[PDB]
Design a protein around this nucleic acid. Sequence first.
DNA 1: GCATCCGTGAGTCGAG
DNA 2: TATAATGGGAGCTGTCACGGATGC
Lengths: 158, 38, 83, 7, 94, 1112, 227, 158, 51
Amino acid sequence: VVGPQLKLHQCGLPKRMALELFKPFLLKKMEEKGIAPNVKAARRMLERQRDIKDEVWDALEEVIHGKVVLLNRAPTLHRLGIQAFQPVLVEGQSIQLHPLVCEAFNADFDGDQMAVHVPLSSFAQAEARIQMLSAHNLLSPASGEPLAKPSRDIILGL
Amino acid sequence: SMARPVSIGEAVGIVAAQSIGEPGTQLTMQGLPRVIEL
Amino acid sequence: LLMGVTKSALSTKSWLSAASFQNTTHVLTEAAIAGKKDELIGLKENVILGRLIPAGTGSDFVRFTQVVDQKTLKAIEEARKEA
Amino acid sequence: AXXXXXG
Amino acid sequence: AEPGIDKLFGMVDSKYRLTVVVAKRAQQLLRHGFKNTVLEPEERPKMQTLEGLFDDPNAVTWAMKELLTGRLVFGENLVPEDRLQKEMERLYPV
Amino acid sequence: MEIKRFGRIREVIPLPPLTEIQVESYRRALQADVPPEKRENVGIQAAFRETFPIEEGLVLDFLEYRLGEPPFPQDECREKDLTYQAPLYARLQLIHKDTGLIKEDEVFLGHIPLMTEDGSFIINGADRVIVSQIHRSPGVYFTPDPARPGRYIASIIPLPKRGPWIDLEVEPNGVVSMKVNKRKFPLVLLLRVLGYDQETLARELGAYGELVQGLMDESVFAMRPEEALIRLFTLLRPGDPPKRDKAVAYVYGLIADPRRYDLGEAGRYKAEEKLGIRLSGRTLARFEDGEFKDEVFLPTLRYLFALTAGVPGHEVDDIDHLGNRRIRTVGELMTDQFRVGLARLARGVRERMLMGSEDSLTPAKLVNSRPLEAAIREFFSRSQLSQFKDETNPLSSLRHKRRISALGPGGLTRERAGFDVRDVHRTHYGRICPVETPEGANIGLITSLAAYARVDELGFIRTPYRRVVGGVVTDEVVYMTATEEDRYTIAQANTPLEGNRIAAERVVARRKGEPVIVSPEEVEFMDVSPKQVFSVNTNLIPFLEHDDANRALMGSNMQTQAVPLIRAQAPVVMTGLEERVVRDSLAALYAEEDGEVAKVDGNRIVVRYEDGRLVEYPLRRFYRSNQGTALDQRPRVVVGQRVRKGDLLADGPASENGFLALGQNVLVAIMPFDGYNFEDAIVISEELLKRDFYTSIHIERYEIEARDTKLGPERITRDIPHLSEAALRDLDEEGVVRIGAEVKPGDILVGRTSFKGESEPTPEERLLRSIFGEKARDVKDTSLRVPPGEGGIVVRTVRLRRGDPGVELKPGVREVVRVYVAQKRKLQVGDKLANRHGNKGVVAKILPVEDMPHLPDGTPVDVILNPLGVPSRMNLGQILETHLGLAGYFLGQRYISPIFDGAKEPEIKELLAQAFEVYFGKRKGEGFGVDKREVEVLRRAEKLGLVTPGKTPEEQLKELFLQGKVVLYDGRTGEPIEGPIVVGQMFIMKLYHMVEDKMHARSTGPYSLITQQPLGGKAQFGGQRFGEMEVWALEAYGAAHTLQEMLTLKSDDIEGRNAAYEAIIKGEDVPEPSVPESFRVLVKELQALALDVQTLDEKDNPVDIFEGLASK
Amino acid sequence: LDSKLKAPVFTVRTQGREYGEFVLEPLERGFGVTLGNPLRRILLSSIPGTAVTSVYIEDVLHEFSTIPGVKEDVVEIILNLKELVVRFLNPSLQTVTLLLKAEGPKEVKARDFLPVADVEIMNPDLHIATLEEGGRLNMEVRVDRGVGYVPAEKHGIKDRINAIPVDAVFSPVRRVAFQVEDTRLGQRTDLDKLTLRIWTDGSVTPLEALNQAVEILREHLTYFSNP
Amino acid sequence: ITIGIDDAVIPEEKKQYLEEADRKLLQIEQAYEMGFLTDRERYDQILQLWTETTEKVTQAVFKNFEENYPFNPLYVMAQSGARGNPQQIRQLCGLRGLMQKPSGETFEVPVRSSFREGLTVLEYFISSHGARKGGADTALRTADSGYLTRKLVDVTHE
Amino acid sequence: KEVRKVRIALASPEKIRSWSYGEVEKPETINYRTLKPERDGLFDERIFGPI
DNA sequence: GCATCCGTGAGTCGAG
DNA sequence: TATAATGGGAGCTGTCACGGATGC
Ligand SMILES: CO[C@H]1/C=C/O[C@@]2(C)Oc3c(C)c(O)c4c(O)c(cc(O)c4c3[C@H]2O)NC(=O)/C(C)=C\C=C\[C@H](C)[C@H](O)[C@@H](C)[C@@H](O)[C@@H](C)[C@H](OC(C)=O)[C@@H]1C
Ligand SMILES: [Mg+2]
């Protein structure tokens, strides 16, 4: 679904998706605070949905801070089929995508789906952030020309 | 992509293949068969 | 000798790559007879083995780079000045 | 069933 | 875009070298509990929580900023590995 | 409200029963209502007639059959997971030749599934539709030789798996060659075997260009039919001894055997018409008076040489022509499999006749039903043409039944399918729809039967045409095959008529598909209606003439995906076909005769007719469809109401007062909104969720079995080890969740405890056990729990148990428990909406009502569509629908605008004018003049050349409203949108692709057995696939460690993934990954292939990746 | 159903008297633009300020005429006069006529205007005109108190036959830009964050400007009192 | 910015260009009658005529837009490059144009209707051939494209 | 050590016998009752390993 | 030298 | 643990686009 509000480097990530994706980190940061005595307690606490509480969301927000995920839309035709975005927790089950990268994925809003991957180590996260960040690739490795550029509504208004 | 010198270690082959392949679905069936022929 | 992309692919040195591409029986038998070794020069090979590919952050060129702060650098410098 | 998603 | 990314791409002969530098530095910071940081207290990256501002938990952010401050030395064959390990352990226990 | 209809076209005949293809095909096949002596030879009757009599000596013969009554009714079959079917009994008589002993008995042949009223089947509890198949009609064809331009290829094709194709070709050397079973041999030889002599072929074929001399061979006529036969047998059968009777038997089996080689009745007729001859049997030759006699080959060779010579009255054939392509319906397919099974039964019967007691044998002791049962069952369960029913809405089922597939057994294989097959042939007109098909791989291979189209007894598709004699159009209708259609000049249906007479001097018509302008003196026939050109889905798109064919396709397809809504409405602009579709799908309940309604209940409707009889109609309520949509009927009448014959009683699913309801009529504004509708995304008003527009009920089935084990029995129980009362709160005494309890992910639907596998406690477990002093229980908790992302209210529980009346399960299973969970889904971001014109999008934003663009009178709009979606796609139908929709919004009336005959611009403008009066004159009467904002907007529109300068504000507002545009205020500002905006009612549907179903994520989960990699699918809580192309992506980015993570740490490196997880939860960075298990598997597989895979170092000295475990 | 709401925290960020940023968070859904738009309208349109309405220059017949001895044409001087920021220290004073006389090789700035009682020139270094040898400039400018923006052709005021009406920019506010960003308090992610940005000429500070704006609005809410 | 049905503007010039065309058609027809032109010659001439006519009415639509209605939504979206190209817009306000037989041969009788005026059943069915062929093209070429990409990757990957 | 190379070659019958932990002399898989591997069968624990 | 035969290829994720 | 019994059946059909091997 298109977020208009997203900065070029950002993507809307559903809360539950992020919770499950980042789950070990969330357990760790839950033990770091007083939310749970230990890891296992935290996991058993997250297992049921009616056991979920306010503090855990702020905890998750602390967890994902500075981190990025990878968005990929099949088919991946060229390098930009995967791009790195800083996740922003959103209400709803839909992933929010930034308009300018659409042309790069050949994505539109008619019901296309995308996949999220979480790079784990410091190395992978560094690679993602420096090399694969959407805002960092502005030009076609193919033609050299601009890749993320105004289209549709934007060009219209301007 | 960066409009500057290529960084050593950049994998060129995959980039070339992808760059040639991506527009391929915009060519019909002298078009795509000519490309494959070449 | 000019050969098309497929034959050129199958004709490469790395038998892992050729075997992953196509004509698996042919490639593999011709590799087994001659007792071929795969030096793992290309990407596909190391991908199959699950190693760090020889490109980007996995290129020998930039991968051995070290980083150190001036404090620790000078401490180690004094350790070197002692001996 | 395929293309951009009629069915 | 990562803050001052252009300068970082300027610092190195290859972008991937920058990547390796930042990753390694970040691992150092994680392992030594941030004690080894070259950043003054006022330069510390901040995460804004419910209570107030706190230290940014993200190691990579730190490493990139440290790198921007020019207070780091990066290159091949600076010091033998076990020596660097033992020394960093000496100055900053873990 | 008043429904105003447009159009001047008068339909002579209505649409035929839409399911007639299915129902009439199957009925024709079974003849269950026909008394045995009156049965025509067709279908299973014909199968019996072919198989019997059986010889070799004893003789088993066929008399008649009978089909009994179903052991269980349809609903009961659906619930008990049975098959709705009737017993098949067969009267046979065993006859000993010598003894003269005759024994007559009725043997039980197993069961034949019955077709339900709506034209579907129930197989093993599931609703299945048998999809009719399109193929190449049997007969004789002549097609141009691709290599040799001057020459041709003759082909003789029988029914599928009814025996081999035959190719007659004139070779470069001059001899005429025949190809059978991929064997080329001179046709002369076969001609000699048939008993032809050189004289006969000389006088018959002599008139030609001396191609006949290529058929002239002296060595062939130098041998009698016997010698020629043995010669041919030696030619076709290398290594097989050339015995006389064996040769006669083989060649007879290949050519003259009706039991083996069979042309269709279609092939019969077609061969007759093409070759200009008359066939006795359905074979190519006969065995008569000890020898062979030729029916076919000589006429065929004659026509071939006559085509080669250039003789007038001889032509090639179009295999894409619908005169040359036919349809095998349900009955023909089922009968085919029945014939196969019967053949197997005959083989078994003979085998049983050879040995065994030769005195005492009965038809019961000879006949085993097993092959026939296994055959029919194979067809209904595993055939590609037997398909899980599409139940999404009634239109889905109806369309599914009308599907024409080129795939399946004997049919085409895609990736083998060319462009010519997928093309729309000129003869598709009135027969197969040019529009409705898939976008993807199957395009042109799967199609839809046209609305007025019919399938004849021969299996060819026919379309109706009105007779025209001397410029007078009669009411006499004639259905034609494409071949017969080619013979006439057929005028278009929109051509002017005064009374029954053609009112135009120049009339548009067709000759062999080619458009031609003729005089009324020349017109033989005229189109029944434009409706006949398209399918049922396509016929539901109003203003279709304004839509590009591709978007028409998209909308057409998309209607099938419409989800039944609790509030669902009929479209404001209909095609007039909305009612028939509901009526034929048997979704809605109707009145059988005239009468009075005695009772009205939510569960039932009781009706007294003129017959004085009380007929009670029960209502299906909240049943789960195959696609999970809730199919329920609701009563539309009241106590005492008088009802004539055919009046509506209960409203089916996706139906409003008898009209087809696929969605809601919402008030739309077409303007860009803050990038929220960017790239086909859609913005909706929260007022839609408030009043429950686009809200749908969905039901999901959960099933669990408790069985007997060698470790002890599983049991459904409320007693679950290590669980609190908090977790057992909603569980009843037996352990089954109660009806009406709300269940969320993690909840227990059904409790179950399984005896633990034999377990050696790890030392830590033993020590901890000593510390807490608690016995380790013998049973563990296997209880069926609500999957992630699922949940709802529990509306039903079914419990079956072994040792209970009427209940027997599969061996080893003690009990089966089912829980039905229904959830009520509102609309939410990520759900897919679409119109009928091919505009499709996902709701990207739900704004509060105050943010929504509104009319001057304070009325907000439900949906904001993006204008950018219109021009590129070229579907203008939605625009007109919107305009007329605006009119209908203010006049409070709906419309019917049939395709190609419908409301045109001027009439829409009149309606919009009246609407303007209602929308404005009221306001003037209310004592409110023109707003300042309306002045600004009017200045703008005046600059845009939209309105004529100098007019009063009211006049210009009317001018805009007539163009379908109104003044709109932005809800956030209060300022007007600088231009006037197009606003109006549009019919939009909620498609079955819903974000609630599709969203999934996983950290860690189950892994595969051999590969040790994460499972696929959301149901399995598996991971996303990172494929070759994603790997290429990462490589091009040159992210090495990310890629290495994907290849190792995240999947299939055991030690690595365990270590990584432990590290992350500990707060430690992830460890260096190791060798992925799938490579170890590769190595071992290669070793199993007798190849040695050695991982070395740079020293060429072996490195052991198995860590010694594999080496002695 | 049962609702809790905390009073938002007003955040101020100011650079000199020329600019400021204003952040109000958290706000209830939709209330970002509910307060935002009105204040924008009120700020630009209704905030009290001073402008140059009319100007007379000796030996100058009309607006597009050229002045011998001066490089800028009359039009360019009128423009420079539009950017003059004049502050009235006395609330009683509705109008002033500022006289300026100069000649010779000198570049006239806003300082050269002869001082008037309770009239402060905020931008004395502002450029008006440059004169060469033999060039003369004799002018009188009419400064009135007013609100918003009034074009010359709208007021059409003249003290003299040769006096030229000038488009009067009264608004001390040069620009208002506001944006509402989604921010979260605890569980709810949609809660509104209002960020407001205001430009001024220095005569009235942005904080003063916004306070005046909310006062005008609040007073209007009292107009619903007595029928 | 919006789209009403009146926003597709059928130029007057169209009618003229049609009548003239008809006239020329007749001329060519006469040329066939007396045997000056062969069948294929006449066919080619008619095709050329209709091609040039189509071009002409496209230019007529766009000139009408440029001069008379510069802010007309179709024209705006086209010119800005936000949506649409001259041919599509021409189909909207102009004539639909020449149509292909399933064989690839072109019909002599072009659709004279815009999507605004609306097509006639025979016209629609005539066009469906083209639509189907195009759609099948799109569906079939994805596979071969993919195959090519894979071959290229495998040959260049080291 | 680090793996820098991968070699493939024809395996000698002696090498094949060297890999093998035993010969499978029986077609049997597991027992129809105990559901445990048979002796000298494809699943035998004697050869391939402990379950 | 040039017709002819046999084997091997023929897009991606999703659900199934 | 003993009349004598002595050569099997099903094929399965609208793809090219070929590559190198094999054949007058
Ligand atoms: C048993 O057949 C299976 C495949 C056999 O293999 C193959 C090789 O032969 C066929 C035949 C003979 C067909 O006609 C197919 C067909 O018409 C398809 C798609 C296919 O792939 C078809 C296949 C094959 O792939 N397109 C449609 O039908 C479209 C135009 C409308 C209906 C869509 C709904 C969603 C379905 O109807 C669905 C409810 C379900 O019924 C099918 C998905 C069914 O799956 C099952 C469980 O029944 C398929 C067809
Ligand atoms: Mg899409």
